[PDB]
């Protein structure tokens, strides 16, 4: 349960079914699998809702790593057809949880970033941030220069 929530990455959804398919036979207490998987009409909704947990948690980490992705690569990553991806692309984007630009002609799609007008942050994080580590060299270098030259 918590393993999918922390650090994410990827796992075959059937392997999660292998673990959560034994909870029907597990027990002792079958009541957790009763209210959930015991009811047919309530389970099928929560089964597809369980899909919404595993497929969107990929979209959450993938939105951080894009950049870009091909449409065919998303199918093997989400472990379903490209059409089910388009359905998961439509229902997640109307919730506006992740901004996405989807081009179906060439298959190249991506999650964010908004068109890259950015100018300041490109130059500022370059000059300010990175060079601060570059100008801090001699600061702590003479600190360690005292360390090595006092003993040796």
């Amino acid at each position: 349960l918590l393993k999918l929530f922390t650090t994410m990455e990827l796992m075959r959804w059937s392997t999660l079914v292998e673990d959560y398919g034994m909870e029907l036979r597990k027990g002792s207490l079958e009541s957790p699998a009763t209210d959930v998987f015991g009811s047919t009409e309530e389970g099928e909704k929560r089964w597809k809702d369980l899909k919404n947990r595993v497929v969107e948690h990929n979209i959450r980490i993938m939105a951080k790593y894009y950049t870009r992705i091909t449409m065919k690569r998303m199918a093997q990553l989400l472990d379903l057809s490209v059409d089910e991806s388009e359905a998961f692309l439509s229902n997640l984007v109307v919730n506006k949880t992740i901004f996405a630009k989807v081009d179906r002609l060439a298959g190249i799609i991506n999650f964010q970033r908004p068109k890259d007008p950015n100018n300041l942050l490109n130059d500022w994080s370059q000059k300010l941030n990175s060079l601060m580590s570059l100008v801090n060299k001699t600061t702590h270098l003479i600190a360690k220069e005292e360390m090595i030259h006092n003993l040796q």
């Binding site: 100018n119 490109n122 130059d123 990175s130 580590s133 570059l134 100008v135 060299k137 001699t138 600061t139 702590h140 270098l141 003479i142 600190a143 360690k144 220069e145 005292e146 360390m147 090595i148 030259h149 006092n150 003993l151 040796q152």
Partner: protein, 286 residues
């Protein structure tokens, strides 16, 4: 505990004027005194201090004495005039530290939980913002030595105060301030390459010396670690700017555009108005 210290030119002079005190009578060692710190927060500040007669024998390299009758009653003096001022540690002019300096701090820890020592310099030479600061902790060691007491460098910075710049900043009178925006930033650039790349060569020659001799320091590992943080861009042949190439000139995009746009209308303000007022006086006079 103590992260950074603030050393005023007034208290630093209290070490320098005592260099005239015992400098004329000599003989060996240096100027040493007890430091009065002002601690309002984790950042340390120093306002005043009192210099005490001190000597360190050579032979006998481990021998040192403060005068503690000078330390006790004179504290009640400065405490009576200034309640906030208290002793945070000691100081000396160095220039370097002999091994005996381990025992000076541990003795006065009865006065302050952690006594910060300040190495100062009476004759400014190199390489930059002067003096120095150390803090007394125990890191032991990785090799398994008995518990090792070694002073860790504390970054020192000069700071100002109200009413103290009256006589101090008056006597110079020869400085040009600044001028911010034209010469101020560019002189730094010529020095940023000088002072930036000289320590680059001084250390890279000592880092090559490691393999040769002087090993340890291994270091380890701090040397290459932050050097690899410097390695986000090397920048080596050639500049690896293929992504930053169009962005290079694109940062100069508007800077050149405005410089082209401002100088056009600034001229229209300078050229027109000059011609107007000139011919009004020039030709109407004769």
């Amino acid at each position: 505990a103590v992260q950074k210290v603030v050393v005023h030119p007034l208290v630093l002079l209290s070490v320098v004027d005592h260099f005239n005190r015992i400098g004329k009578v000599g003989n060996q060692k240096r100027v040493v005194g007890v430091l009065l710190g002002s601690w309002q927060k984790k950042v340390l500040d120093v306002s005043n201090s009192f210099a005490v007669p001190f000597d360190e024998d050579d032979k006998d390299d481990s021998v040192w004495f403060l005068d503690h009758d000078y330390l006790e009653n004179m504290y009640g003096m400065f405490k009576k005039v200034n309640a906030r001022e208290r002793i945070v540690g000691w100081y000396h002019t160095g220039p370097k530290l002999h091994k005996n300096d381990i025992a000076i701090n541990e003795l006065m820890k009865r006065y302050c939980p952690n006594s910060v020592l300040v190495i100062i310099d009476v004759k400014p030479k190199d390489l930059g913002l002067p003096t120095e600061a150390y803090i007394s902790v125990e890191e032991v060691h990785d090799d398994g030595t008995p518990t090792s007491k070694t002073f860790e460098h504390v970054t020192s910075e000069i700071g100002a105060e109200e009413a103290e710049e009256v006589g101090v900043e008056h006597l110079l009178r020869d400085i040009k301030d600044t001028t911010v925006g034209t010469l101020s930033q560019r002189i730094t650039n010529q020095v940023h390459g000088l002072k930036g790349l000289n320590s680059k060569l001084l250390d890279i020659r000592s880092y090559l010396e490691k393999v040769a001799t002087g090993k340890l320091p291994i270091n380890h590992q701090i040397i290459y670690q932050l050097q690899d943080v410097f390695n986000l861009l090397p920048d080596v042949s050639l500049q690896e700017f293929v992504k930053a190439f169009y962005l290079k000139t694109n940062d100069q995009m508007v800077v050149v555009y405005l410089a082209s746009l401002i100088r056009s209308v600034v001229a229209l303000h300078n050229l027109i108005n000059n011609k107007i007022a000139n011919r009004d006086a020039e030709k109407k006079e004769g």
